[PDB]
Prior knowledge:
2 copies of one chain form a homodimer.
Chain A: E1 14-17, E2 23-26, E3 32-33, E4 39-40, H1 42-50, H2 54-61, H3 65-71, H4 75-90, E5 99-100, H5 108-112, E6 118-119, H6 143-151, H7 165-175, H8 200-203, H9 207-213, E7 224-226, E8 229-231, H10 235-238, H11 265-288, H12 294-322, H13 348-353, E9 364-366, E10 369-371, H14 373-376, H15 381-386, H16 388-397, H17 414-426, H18 432-438, H19 447-451, H20 455-464, H21 472-478, H22 489-504, H23 522-529, H24 533-540
Antiparallel strand pairs in A: 1-2, 3-4, 5-6, 7-8, 9-10
The structure holds protoporphyrin IX containing FE (HEM) (2 copies), a molecule of 3 linked components (NAG-NAG-NAG) (2 copies), octyl beta-D-glucopyranoside (3 copies), (2S)-2-[6-(methylsulfanyl)naphthalen-2-yl]propanoic acid (T1N) (2 copies) and 2-acetamido-2-deoxy-beta-D-glucopyranose (NAG) (4 copies).
Residues 374-375, 379, 381-382, 385 of chain A line the site of one 2-acetamido-2-deoxy-beta-D-glucopyranose (NAG).
Membrane topology (chain B): Peripheral membrane protein
Subunit structure (chain B): Homodimer.
Pathway (chain B): Lipid metabolism; prostaglandin biosynthesis
Amino acid sequence: ANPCCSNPCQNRGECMSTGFDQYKCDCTRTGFYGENCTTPEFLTRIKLLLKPTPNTVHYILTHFKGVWNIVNNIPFLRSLIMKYVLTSRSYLIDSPPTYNVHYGYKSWEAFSNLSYYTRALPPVADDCPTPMGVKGNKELPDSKEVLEKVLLRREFIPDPQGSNMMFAFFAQHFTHQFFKTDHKRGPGFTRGLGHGVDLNHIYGETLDRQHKLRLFKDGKLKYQVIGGEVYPPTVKDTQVEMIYPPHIPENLQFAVGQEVFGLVPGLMMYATIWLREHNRVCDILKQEHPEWGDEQLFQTSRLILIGETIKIVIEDYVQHLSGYHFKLKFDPELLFNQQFQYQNRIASEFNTLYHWHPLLPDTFNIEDQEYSFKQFLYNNSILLEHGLTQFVESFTRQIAGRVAGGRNVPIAVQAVAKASIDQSREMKYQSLNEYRKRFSLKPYTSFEELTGEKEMAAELKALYSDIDVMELYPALLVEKPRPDAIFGETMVELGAPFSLKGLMGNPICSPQYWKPSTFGGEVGFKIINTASIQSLICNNVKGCPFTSFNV
Amino acid sequence: ANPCCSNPCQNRGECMSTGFDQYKCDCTRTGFYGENCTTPEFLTRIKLLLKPTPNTVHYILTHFKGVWNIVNNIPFLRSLIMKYVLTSRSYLIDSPPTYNVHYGYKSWEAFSNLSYYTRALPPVADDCPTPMGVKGNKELPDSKEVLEKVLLRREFIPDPQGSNMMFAFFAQHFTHQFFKTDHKRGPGFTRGLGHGVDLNHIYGETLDRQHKLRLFKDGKLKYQVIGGEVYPPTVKDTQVEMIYPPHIPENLQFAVGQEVFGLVPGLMMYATIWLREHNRVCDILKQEHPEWGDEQLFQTSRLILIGETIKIVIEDYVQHLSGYHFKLKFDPELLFNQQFQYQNRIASEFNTLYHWHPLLPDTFNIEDQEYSFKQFLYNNSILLEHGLTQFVESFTRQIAGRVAGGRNVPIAVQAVAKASIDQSREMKYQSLNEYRKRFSLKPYTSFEELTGEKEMAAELKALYSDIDVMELYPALLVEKPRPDAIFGETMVELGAPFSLKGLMGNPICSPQYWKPSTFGGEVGFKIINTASIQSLICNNVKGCPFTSFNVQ
Lengths: 551, 552
Ligand code: HEM
Ligand code: HEM
Ligand SMILES: *[C@@H]1O[C@H](CO)[C@@H](O[C@@H]2O[C@H](CO)[C@@H](O[C@@H]3O[C@H](CO)[C@@H](O)[C@H](O)[C@H]3NC(C)=O)[C@H](O)[C@H]2NC(C)=O)[C@H](O)[C@H]1NC(C)=O
Ligand SMILES: *[C@@H]1O[C@H](CO)[C@@H](O[C@@H]2O[C@H](CO)[C@@H](O[C@@H]3O[C@H](CO)[C@@H](O)[C@H](O)[C@H]3NC(C)=O)[C@H](O)[C@H]2NC(C)=O)[C@H](O)[C@H]1NC(C)=O
Ligand SMILES: CCCCCCCCO[C@@H]1O[C@H](CO)[C@@H](O)[C@H](O)[C@H]1O
Ligand SMILES: CCCCCCCCO[C@@H]1O[C@H](CO)[C@@H](O)[C@H](O)[C@H]1O
Ligand SMILES: CCCCCCCCO[C@@H]1O[C@H](CO)[C@@H](O)[C@H](O)[C@H]1O
Ligand SMILES: CSc1ccc2cc([C@H](C)C(=O)O)ccc2c1
Ligand SMILES: CSc1ccc2cc([C@H](C)C(=O)O)ccc2c1
Ligand SMILES: *[C@@H]1O[C@H](CO)[C@@H](O)[C@H](O)[C@H]1NC(C)=O
Ligand SMILES: *[C@@H]1O[C@H](CO)[C@@H](O)[C@H](O)[C@H]1NC(C)=O
Ligand SMILES: *[C@H]1O[C@H](CO)[C@@H](O)[C@H](O)[C@H]1NC(C)=O
Ligand SMILES: *[C@H]1O[C@H](CO)[C@@H](O)[C@H](O)[C@H]1NC(C)=O
């Protein structure tokens, strides 16, 4: 019944029904005009001819290493390029946010209700004849058939980019502060009301949970010492709620900011490292300010760690992830003369694209042992047995799996990958090509163009029939990757806008926050600006072992 | 004992303790340097020479009417000036917000917790020797004495700008959507978690309250017809909570978005008008969109009424109180090429300054009846007896009181004015002169310079002793007003930045929202851009009576 089902409006245009069978496109500030916002303006047609494709831009950033080495050592040029990447990625994000799972139009409910994930593209209306609008069959192909034919792992495919298990667990740990689906409400709802890098996975979402995790002396968090080593406190000591199977004994029930971090020893590894980092910064600030009380020591330490997180994410995590020869920089001062909104809302599509379960290996290799999924999960004894030092050493060496390229999802995690497909359909996601068009990409003309391959493409041809009906999530995992890279085009071009906006949109990056006094003076400001994944491990892990995000 | 108690850092520099008896001033991006951020930069010194005083700017804006009449008719010049008044005012507001009642330093708790009012200036630390820091006596002057000497009304002092009761009640109605103090928690806490113009005073703060007020047909809100006239529904029929005394009959307990709006018929008048406006917009949108369901019709009408509100507040309400000959403009497009943050947090000081109880007359005059406070309060039968038409006609004629100039607070609300002094002390407010410096104003050197008069000044000097110890709230009500104006310098120079930032910081003013599609097309978009206080009354009140924010 809805005439906007076909998604007729192009180039960020907005559809609105003007009757039972009539529609109108709003072409305001698109650079286009006409019935479908397709006829380009004079300034736009010049920009389209001069605009290089993402593949060409990726090529320049991954080649000419000698030139980039000179570029990285000229401060004003490095700053200018990094300034451009922050602005050009961020304008792709709507801020303040617009749509959500229940609203395909703008409303005060969609803006004001923080329990929703926002949406990059509006949901397909309930009264549309097909799930994708008008194209394809009345039903999408069975999710289990899609899972088994093109997604599930036959043999382990390693990442050619060299990502290790330190990278995979950092990704899981970091993103689980802002990806916290409220399952009793639905897939499109979140428990992370801060919508970004607030470190609620260390400090808790609520004030009650935070206060239960705090020592209330010297700004520190509660901790226990087992075998001479500092670990998170217990559930018995703190009374915080954690997700644990009934057989886990009281002494192994570790209590951290996020309730699900006891599921994986890899997560509990980073939880321990960051807890140790917080108390370490408290010691530094206590030395600097003996006149400060517990409360200010805690709050200032939290702000420093937020700064540290964004610094590490940009200059180590995303740096390795992009695979660029250009040296990325975390510098809020770059946006001070630029139009930028210091706010963020976590998008549902950002959640979906970040389901990087192909990263997971067949077995988890620590020291001399190889642990299966059943042996590894919920089993924090492994952490106490080997220790943090051995965890860092082992996970730095162990190669993670390739995400794009197809057929690399572990069978032990098949239900989660099936859920990603089923819940995307529940939230009425638009097709892959619609999302590609939304982020300035050319739509795929065939399944062979998507995969860069013949076998999987033919299997997807029989299931979906049409390329304009292909779903976003399965396409991301099967997509043709860049030369010796972990991801394909769509992942980088959707992920970069969401990521950088969520990192720079933090209040600590705003002009009134980005100053030494915010972080307790020059000493706290220095902790942020000199932070790295290596120094995080060196200061908090015994022996100062070597680590990086690649093998 | 805290070294930052004296407030040593000047020009918006930040104080940080570097020991038990040592401090450090962070002069980052202030334009100043030195131990106290007092030594100006080269370009800062130049800017301070060319920068005119607020009094000089006010003069030019309130004089040369023949020149402004030409300026208003030149669209690019009108846009240029309005752009400047938006950007230069908003620059004074920290966004994202910083301090609150419990935090004199920046923290995540202060940023994230929406239950707090934000603070333009940090609170005086709990360990400071005096309430204002280091200056003054151990205790501030008796609040009863301050109230009775310089604040209380002897005889009614009318506003020289001509403000009427339509203005007074609009101010109360409008601001009470974001000024909603959570007295269960304390004076520094709010119930208005939207922190701006969301129209929760019509639609409810919570979703549960909204649905109890909604008809769920044609996007409309529930209503009743009493004597051929549309009024809000009852508490009995809807189960929405309202604050009423136990003696009020069921048929007189009207239920609206804001729980306190049964307090005065003046609030209920505007509640009824806006309720009628929402359902009127619902009929307009149904004509344009027969295919639309109830949910979309309701949500689109809300966004439209939010647009109408900001339009009326800028072009009619703020226009009148400013007293400028320059025609102000509501145009979000003015900020699309400017650095601006589309977010807002309500400041405690903005709440404090907006306590405009001197506006209230001794009696409320409707038709040929003069109602006392005792007769007026919690009495919705007055509204039913006279009707909305007579209410609008009467309130347009009745002069409101002068806010500044001292001694004009109605005795009936003396406890409210005393509470404002007490709660400001409770929230550990910095001095008047500290807030003046914060908003780029020269500090007063005497109480005579503050009042422009000799009697009240001497009364305040006997109480406070020092001008640097004078409190913000009482000073706003006793300040020397501008020529024939309602407010003094401090009220305007604090009020304008808070007000304009709140209005333009609304998401509907952002580029992705500010387009016809958001408001149901060109028809719904026109409703916003043509909205006025006259049109609001004309479309919703029988007989389209003349209305204005000033007396004729
Ligand atoms: C260590 C082994 C892992 C296990 C056992 C695991 C398991 C799970 C499970 C059970 C869910 C809930 C699915 C649902 O909604 O029904 C989930 C969601 C998710 N997974 Fe994993 N996962 C693992 C590693 C990872 C890694 C390395 C990443 C990469 C970032 C990742 C990304 C995500 C994300 C972003 C979600 C959604 C979170 C939310 O919205 O609440 N996972 N995973
Ligand atoms: C119509 C007669 C009025 C009465 C009877 C009245 C009474 C009151 C009372 C009792 C309070 C304290 C609320 C409480 O603590 O329970 C209050 C607060 C306040 N008044 Fe009025 N007032 C009136 C008119 C006005 C007007 C015309 C304005 C101008 C805008 C105004 C501005 C305010 C503001 C901004 C607050 C603070 C609200 C809050 O923090 O929640 N009032 N008033
Ligand atoms: C953000 O949006 C969410 C989705 O609308 C809201 O969550 C919903 O709140 C509703 C109202 O409280 C709940 O309705 C329930 O069912 C009926 C009305 O249909 C009522 O009689 C019940 O009292 C009410 N409560 C329950 C749980 O039975 C919804 O159940 C609830 N959940 C969902 C996913 O729809 C959020 O409230 C909203 N957040 C805010 C702050 O407004
Ligand atoms: C925004 O800040 C508010 C002020 O700090 C918070 O409100 C306070 O939350 C506290 C609970 O986290 C309450 O204090 C008490 O804490 C003890 C812990 O030992 C509990 O047992 C009590 O149940 C609890 N309250 C009671 C009933 O005594 C405060 O009552 C409460 N209010 C004030 C004015 O302090 C908000 O929680 C915070 N908002 C968010 C979202 O974090
Ligand atoms: C080598 C110099 C280029 C700087 C890197 C810019 C980062 C990528 O920039 C991206 O490029 C895409 C293709 O042009 C566009 O679709 C995106 O809008 C843009 O953000
Ligand atoms: C010469 C400027 C006239 C244009 C009207 C601007 C509206 C008032 O602008 C205000 O002026 C004050 C005094 O100059 C400043 O302290 C404020 O920062 C500024 O916002
Ligand atoms: C109409 C007379 C106005 C002058 C009152 C100011 C002088 C202080 O007089 C006070 O007036 C209050 C209000 O009536 C009373 O509650 C106090 O008992 C009284 O002391
Ligand atoms: C969330 S997945 C992802 C993949 C690739 C990314 C690349 C960049 C670089 C810096 C760019 O802007 O091109 C940034 C973030 C990215 C995130
Ligand atoms: C809340 S009290 C108040 C007093 C005076 C105001 C003046 C202006 C004008 C348009 C300006 O910016 O000078 C705007 C808002 C104002 C608010
Ligand atoms: C938990 O870890 C221990 C030691 O690494 C191992 O022996 C045991 O098999 C694990 N438990 C489970 C349930 O597999
Ligand atoms: C309420 O107003 C009516 C006029 O409609 C008046 O007769 C009555 O006395 C008032 N009630 C009170 C309590 O003063
Ligand atoms: C928009 O494009 C053209 C108008 O140029 C028209 O033929 C077409 O039907 C419209 N809609 C769609 C679904 O392409
Ligand atoms: C700050 O100003 C000077 C330093 O130039 C210093 O002597 C003085 O003591 C300070 N003033 C205050 C407010 O203490």
